[PDB]
């Protein structure tokens, strides 16, 4: 699509293998903000949106958060708080045609807006000068912007990672739909409503989450930890020592409670 009326394709409920795109050498530039290009296979997300348009190497740098210029201000404006990455590759074989593409046109605006309209005689739409006989920084490039909305809904788009069985009553390093952490998973009697997937305590800390495949409600309690204090008579008397574990049950290695 043209940058004045870019396409927005919805991606949901599937397994996205990003290793093929990350390993592929076919991209001219691959600059990621938000997530690393090689770790995107492990994280899990709610939705993916693909903003597709053609621009030029000159001014192509404006597809980055908070940028200004004729294109960034009048055609496509990215928000300052962008959580996603922009990918670009040379598209000479598909988007360049001899003489000139007037098929692609370019026109501030709020982020992710869409204004397709027409109104000292001036009109707001201008045509792009795609020349295949010109300087290289003016030849059209196909750009696809992947904008990611995280926490907005249950996670549904994530990479190919083999699952394992779940182990109870031990602190384990878990990854549930992109939420990572350590703690002991036990059964709970908190009746979640069918549509809610995870619960958070005060100051954004997860207390429970609903697992996939068996849909049970597991409370997440951090595994027992504490400081180690040393009781010592002194280097002038003996090398005997005592250890105090502050207010925790040491059911995991005389012992006085």
């Amino acid at each position, epitope marked *: 699509a043209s940058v004045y009326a870019w396409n927005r394709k919805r991606i949901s409920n599937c397994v996205a293998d990003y290793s093929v795109l990350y390993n592929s050498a076919s991209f001219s530039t691959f600059k990621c903000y938000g997530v690393s290009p090689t770790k995107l296979n492990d994280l899990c997300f709610t939705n993916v949106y693909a903003d597709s348009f053609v621009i030029r190497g000159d001014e192509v740098r404006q597809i980055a958060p908070g940028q200004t210029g004729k294109i960034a201000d009048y055609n496509y404006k990215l928000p300052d708080d962008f959580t996603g990455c922009v990918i670009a590759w040379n598209s000479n074989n598909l988007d360049s045609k001899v003489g000139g593409n007037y098929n692609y046109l370019y026109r501030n605006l709020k982020p992710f807006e869409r204004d397709i309209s027409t109104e000292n005689c001036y009109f707001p739409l201008q045509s792009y000068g795609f020349q*295949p006989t010109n300087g290289v920084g003016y030849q059209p490039y196909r750009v696809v912007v992947l904008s990611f909305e995280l926490l907005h809904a249950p996670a549904t788009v994530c990479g190919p990672k083999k699952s394992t069985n779940l182990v109870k009553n031990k602190c384990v390093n878990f990854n549930f739909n992109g939420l990572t952490g350590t703690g002991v998973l036990t059964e709970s009697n908190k009746k979640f409503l069918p549509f809610q997937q995870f619960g958070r305590d005060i100051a954004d800390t997860t207390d429970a989450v609903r697992d996939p495949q068996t849909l049970e409600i597991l409370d997440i309690t951090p595994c027992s930890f504490g400081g180690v204090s040393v009781i010592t008579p002194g280097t002038n008397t003996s090398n005997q020592v005592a250890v105090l574990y502050q207010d925790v049950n040491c059911t995991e290695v005389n012992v006085f409670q």
Partner: antibody
Amino acid sequence: QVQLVQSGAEVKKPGASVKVSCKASGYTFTSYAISWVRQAPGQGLEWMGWVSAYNGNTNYAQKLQGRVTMTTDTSTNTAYMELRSLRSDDTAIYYCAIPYSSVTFDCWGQGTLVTV
Amino acid sequence: EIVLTQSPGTLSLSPGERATLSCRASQSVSGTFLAWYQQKPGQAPRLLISGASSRATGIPDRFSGSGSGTDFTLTISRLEPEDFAVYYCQQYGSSRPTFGQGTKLEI
């Protein structure tokens, strides 16, 4: 669905002028720029020139400079080509052409033979 | 200016065997900025390959093109009776694009 019908064949005397039209339909005439190619019978193709259908900017060939002139009517979605002071060897099948879904070659016209 | 020369004007081959075509350039041309043309008798020229490697819509896999820089080659694996036509090579790397003179295939 895209069809381009050009004007009929022309027979003329040396030194005179000829204009060839090509009507366009089934696509946005302004969106795709027009291209002209000449092919003498038995010889190869030679590109003639470019004129965008949005603003009208110009890029002619040096060999044919000072003799060729293209204009386009956006209202009737029709492209024109004016050629003055013809000589004998310029007798050829003249095509109008826009690139569609391709870098070049798309929509070559049915051709117009100008006999000088 | 970049001039084109195709070494075989006509190739006389029985249908079924291997055919090769050449078309080289004088000054270096980017590989991407290339195409190849088949012009039937009495019909408009048709793009067989563009980008010097990639076929267009509706092109049989028997055709294929290759090469980069100045020297370029067109491949036809199996010769069918309808394939006997004229083929044009064209480069548009810088400024004016230059077309080919044509090569005819004979039974």
